[PDB]
Structure 1
């Protein structure tokens, strides 16, 4: 009972951008008020929590292109 597996993916992709002039970008947030009351806080096994955040981001990638590629081969008898 012979088994023969061949996994030959080809990818010639191009995630491309072109942008002549990126700019003149103003991010002027006007402040705020945050209150959080808790008694107890238990966490376990790969928890990702934020509690009480006042957070400003300005993110101007000239490019900002992303490619995510997952090859997963699994074999069981």
Structure 2
């Protein structure tokens, strides 16, 4: 016969104090984008992008990530 026991335990305190978060700035693609094209011959899929794209400005006043995982297999 089989006897199995699991006792995970945690208290942890993942913390982040700030007195004053200030004055973040972000200027992607300030400048000028130009794209000329003549006599182009494609015989398959095309994807294009031009300009400012996919620009993130994440500012988590927190941003305290915490993660956990627990597997327990038996055959």
- Verify the 8 A CA contact 1:36 1:52 in the aligned structure 2: no
Shift of 1:30: 1.7
Give the Cα–Cα distance (whole angstroms) in 1 for the partners of residues 3 and 43 of structure 2: 42
Structure 2: 5+ residue runs without aligned partners?
none
CA 1:26–1:52 in structure 2 vs 1: closer, same or farther (change >3 Å)? closer
Aligned residue-pair number: 75
* Larger Cα-atom Rg: 2
Give the Cα–Cα distance (whole angstroms) in 2 for the partners of residues 46 and 73 of structure 1: 46
Task: Provide runs of 4+ in structure 1 moved above 2 Å.
Answer: 31-54
Structure 1: 5+ residue runs without aligned partners?
none
Deviations 1:37-69 (CA, angstroms, capped at 9, x unpaired):
999999999999999993100011110011110
- Verify the 8 A CA contact 2:29 2:52 in the aligned structure 1: no
Give the Cα–Cα distance (whole angstroms) in 1 for the partners of residues 39 and 4 of structure 2: 53
- In angstroms, what is the RMSD of aligned CA positions? 6.8
What TM-score do the two structures reach when normalised by structure 2?
0.67
